Amino acid sequence: MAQFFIHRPIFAWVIALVIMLAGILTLTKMPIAQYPTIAPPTVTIAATY
Amino acid sequence: LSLEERESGAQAPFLYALSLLIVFLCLAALYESWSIPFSVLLVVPLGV
Amino acid sequence: LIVALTFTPALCATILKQHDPNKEPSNNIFARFFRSFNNGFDRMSHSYQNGVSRMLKGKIFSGVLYAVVVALLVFLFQKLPSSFLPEEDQGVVMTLV
């Protein structure tokens, strides 16, 4: 409720700061790539006569 | 296990320092005061 | 939505300050630029209402404009070329012999 946080400002700052810290932490341990994994599986079979 | 153990030890200090920041933030939202939390934080070494 | 319901109202209550009921000087170089912008939007505003009023009155015109915009949309979709993924210079060339 807006009314709830209007009268309790310090609490709101605490929710915001936690969400931000959580992001910062993930950012250090989150992988980076150009594209999301999109390669289709392939199997090749080989035989010689 | 020799190879594995070496890497494992360094990490533990930081979790202790992360926990403290989070606890301070929680305390503050409970009391609505930035300062009150410091008294509760002080008590920790006494226990250990 | 969550932030707006929580963080923004809390900020509004504290960061913002009560409007000064009487502020006679109200002059600064940056303020002058803003006062012009502030009045421009209001000129923009009246025209929009008048435009809307006329539009509500002149139904045929509104209908023909809507029809036209729809038509162009149809035409244009057919005419635009298509592709999957755009081409990029990756600094390498492969020559096959």
Largest sheet of chain A: none
Give the chain pair forming the largest contact, with residue counts: A-C, 11 and 10 residues
Rg from alpha-carbon coordinates of chain A: 24 Å
> Number of helical runs of chain A?
2
**Oligomeric state:** part of a larger assembly
User: For the terminal residues of chain A, how far apart are their CA atoms?
Assistant: 76 Å
PDB class: membrane protein/antibiotic
Keywords: multidrug efflux pump, MEMBRANE PROTEIN-ANTIBIOTIC complex
Entry title: Multidrug Efflux pump AdeJ with TP-6076 bound
Chains A, B, C: Efflux pump membrane transporter
Please, could you describe this protein's structure?
Chain A has helices at 2-6, 9-28. By secondary structure, chain A is mainly α. Chains in contact: A-B, A-C.
Q: What is the element layout, followed by pairings?
A:
This is part of a larger assembly, with 3 copies of chain A.
Chain A lengths: L1 H5 L2 H20 L21
What is shown here, in short?
The first copy, chain A, is mostly helical and 49 residues long.
